[PDB]
């Protein structure tokens, strides 16, 4: 429109209908100039990397991008509490995104002092990768998302991508992408940008915990009509071999026939938070479970959805089997256990195997009069018919969605870090300040200009997402477990600001508090 | 998906079976109940045509640098690749895959 | 046909000429007939877009053996051809012609 | 249709309308099996060639082809005489082609004796290269065309083609063509094949000889209003330099100004048919004019249309400047001059330069008081503005058309051997006997079959061409030169059969007997 007219209003609210909840969040953003308007080839050689497992090749772009792939970007703690305490499931339906109130500033430095002024004629470029023609980086748990607290002003992260690499070198199959080779809208201070997105059909997330275990689905009062081999010898010596059979009933539930079995496994090492119970050696990387791709080892992290620990074993965790969040103010490198928040998936112990245990035991020979029957620990077990399992729970500060890789085949493409897997997720939204050259020389020079006016941009961003709800219809008589704040007095209110205005999330919040039968 | 490569189908193209009808030789002038085992030596020849329509998925890549492409080598050789020899023998000098273009993962 | 290569036209795309309008500095308070030689130092910047529609002549060759095609080399290198360097410098490593497909004379 | 019904009639006649003549010719052909149904790579190594100039690479196909690219295939000698004596020009308009009365035979050899019988179920395959996707070999003066005499039965020539070569080896750009990769009609004894073709617009062939010379177009009674420098010195000593000018008139026609000049040249060596006037040395290849392509030298043959000889110099010919036809029964290698028929282009001496002379003389220095004026013989001269020329004449036994090479540029694409140049000439008509395998083994073998029944095919071929005529409207008073037979008694009639039934063409017949002004 014009310089003196706002191009949008501040929309931040949650609307709770019967089967739907609409979340709207608005944030103020700041966008600097990245790479001084240049594309730069990057690799482990440029960053000084040495290990083969961490070698990479890619490019850093002068473009930024908007990321809102975390639940706290849309749900307040109270809204999250309502969702998790009142619904058996939820899923995103549609998306509305807006950029408005664009403000481009120029910075001039004379001598140790910088002056900031408006540049009303400068432009900012925005476009969406609706055709998914660029590498998708929103599927990784990267920082730079919209802040959970609406009053926080955030910096737009720089967009970068990786391609095929051989050490620090590239190959002929490696791809280079120029983001200026895409049509993009150019916005001055009076212009705004908006688009709508429809989520593809995804299953409802399981925001419930099973009230039954897979091995306890039988009637505890009635025998089965099936038999089991109870004895093989002749009880109370030589030549004592005689078959025996008994009815599988309530007294021996472990041997009853069952139609379904727990889901797959890939065993993790077990770590205690009581440090003196751990071995006196360096076992992080060495002791960890991993997978290999083209000679590179990548940590199995977080891996298959598996129960974090056995009942009562709360002190133990799988070495890389769980999402680890950092508390407010936590450092980047080598922080103590009290500075991080270790999530756990104990709710899925009713259907999923324990991460630090074998799947089970399997026969490994043919027993005879000369050879005793032998069994072997199944340390990893693939998908088998009749298996059932629960996916990893999602969290308030955890990811929402991920892009399913474009491959010939996949199985249960639920993101392993939690969330909704989609072939066509919300498109990447890329933003960049248009370069403004400084005064050029009065004589023609064919070289590209390298002198630009120092600029940055700021504005507001709004994203509205409609969520579909799956209401609970339980006939359970006793009250359910519910997420609740603790009344006991404390220096600060949980999920609030401190005396210095710092917002903090004191604990990870899952979604599985209500219960339903298996 | 077939492990040797290709398209797996519950109802693939049906088997097409062909046989020359037996033509008995001169039978004896007195009835014999045994099946005939004397036949005229025969063989058949003809032409066979098969037409298949293939659907294509075009590429919409935004890649800037040129892609890898299958190409013949200009360097001189005694014979042209995928052609006949001086004795009329056709040969396929190398296996050719399908994966030369690129797309993101 | 232009000897350096390309399409010769009596009426090619017209020349597009651009200039910053001079902005005089403060003139003297007494009239002087000489043309002004004191101007505000100025420069201009903006975006330029050009769209060209090209007509294509498809190939209908009956050649049996595969053609020569322009292709990138898979072998590892420090930089990707037709891409930016670690300093953001774009380079064109080789000239690329247009004559790879073949047809009879 | 059926075995016992003819699929076509014998059509062979010429119909003369006002401005059009329609020629129809029917011939009986025989088609054997070529290369034993195989494609074979051929080169100068396979044929034993050694010279670089004659090196080649290509393929020989099992297909035959129909060729009617010679005028005597359509015009009888009497029709040719009428055409050349009554018309100033002619050009082909449209084409009709027919194959019918297909007869496929099988040959069986027991011991030194062959038995031939019909194979009613065998097929012959025919298709036309209407899209010009195959190498065009009809543009070369090859043998194998329809015989001039309708009663002669001819053998179908085998189709072969050449591609790019480096010595006896091929390159990556070389192309291999499989003619079975084309849709073709399969004909049994009851089937027939036919198609129609329309000639693209071509200029009328010049079937006239100019009655004026390019240097004698002025009025012989009137002076020009232009002057010439007649003298430079001071006639009848030193210091005698004085300019002079005179009117160019009838007394000095050589110096008159002229608007047009004779056409281009590329000088040929001069050979006498009186052998004792030639040099006592071997000068064929060495003394010949040539052009070079990619390091290979190709004889300039016949080259630019140039007058064969000066007036009265009938004994001389240009070393490779003229079409040479062989008399009936003439051998293939090293025949005497009386066994061949040397064509001449003396009719174009009025506009075209003499093949064995320089184009002219050009100044090569700046004359002065110290340096005498110098001139140099122009041995070859390219196209210049104002040039006019006549193309090479066509002959009864000469070629009709040729395919203009598909290139970015060309100048006056009239075939240098004579005829009409076309981007889309009459398409190649390719024919092959379908292989009939012998008895295969009773056990499966994956190798291609190499045992086939010996077969050949025969039938009739008809081609009808409509020609447009350009009538003469001359006001010439005296009678014209006309082609005529000689009444004087002879043992045989010219253009007839001998006592052994051998048809012969005793002389080449041009088209340029009538006259018109320049």
PDB file of N, CA and C in Angstrom, chain A residues 438-445 449:
ATOM      1  N   UNK A 438      26.449   0.097  -3.598  1.00  0.00           N
ATOM      2  CA  UNK A 438      26.947   1.422  -3.255  1.00  0.00           C
ATOM      3  C   UNK A 438      27.227   2.183  -4.551  1.00  0.00           C
ATOM      4  N   UNK A 439      27.869   3.338  -4.436  1.00  0.00           N
ATOM      5  CA  UNK A 439      28.156   4.144  -5.617  1.00  0.00           C
ATOM      6  C   UNK A 439      29.138   3.413  -6.523  1.00  0.00           C
ATOM      7  N   UNK A 440      28.782   3.135  -7.773  1.00  0.00           N
ATOM      8  CA  UNK A 440      29.710   2.455  -8.678  1.00  0.00           C
ATOM      9  C   UNK A 440      30.714   3.436  -9.253  1.00  0.00           C
ATOM     10  N   UNK A 441      31.831   2.949  -9.790  1.00  0.00           N
ATOM     11  CA  UNK A 441      32.793   3.853 -10.429  1.00  0.00           C
ATOM     12  C   UNK A 441      32.204   4.488 -11.678  1.00  0.00           C
ATOM     13  N   UNK A 442      32.730   5.667 -12.010  1.00  0.00           N
ATOM     14  CA  UNK A 442      32.265   6.408 -13.177  1.00  0.00           C
ATOM     15  C   UNK A 442      32.767   5.816 -14.489  1.00  0.00           C
ATOM     16  N   UNK A 443      33.679   4.850 -14.437  1.00  0.00           N
ATOM     17  CA  UNK A 443      34.165   4.147 -15.614  1.00  0.00           C
ATOM     18  C   UNK A 443      33.707   2.697 -15.549  1.00  0.00           C
ATOM     19  N   UNK A 444      33.249   2.178 -16.686  1.00  0.00           N
ATOM     20  CA  UNK A 444      32.677   0.839 -16.722  1.00  0.00           C
ATOM     21  C   UNK A 444      33.700  -0.211 -16.305  1.00  0.00           C
ATOM     22  N   UNK A 445      33.260  -1.136 -15.456  1.00  0.00           N
ATOM     23  CA  UNK A 445      34.052  -2.290 -15.055  1.00  0.00           C
ATOM     24  C   UNK A 445      33.160  -3.521 -15.115  1.00  0.00           C
ATOM     25  N   UNK A 449      29.644  -6.281  -8.885  1.00  0.00           N
ATOM     26  CA  UNK A 449      29.808  -5.320  -7.806  1.00  0.00           C
ATOM     27  C   UNK A 449      29.993  -6.039  -6.474  1.00  0.00           C
TER      28      UNK A 449
END
